[PDB]
Amino acid sequence: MVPNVVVTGLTLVCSSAPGPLELDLTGDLESFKKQSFVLKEGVEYRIKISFRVNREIVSGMKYIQHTYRAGVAIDATDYMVGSYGPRAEEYEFLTPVEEAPKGMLARGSYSIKSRFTDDDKTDHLSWEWNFTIKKDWK
Question: Could you tell me at which residue positions the Glycyl lysine isopeptide (Lys-Gly) (interchain with G-Cter in SUMO1) crosslink is annotated in this chain?
Answer without folding.
Answer: 73, 76
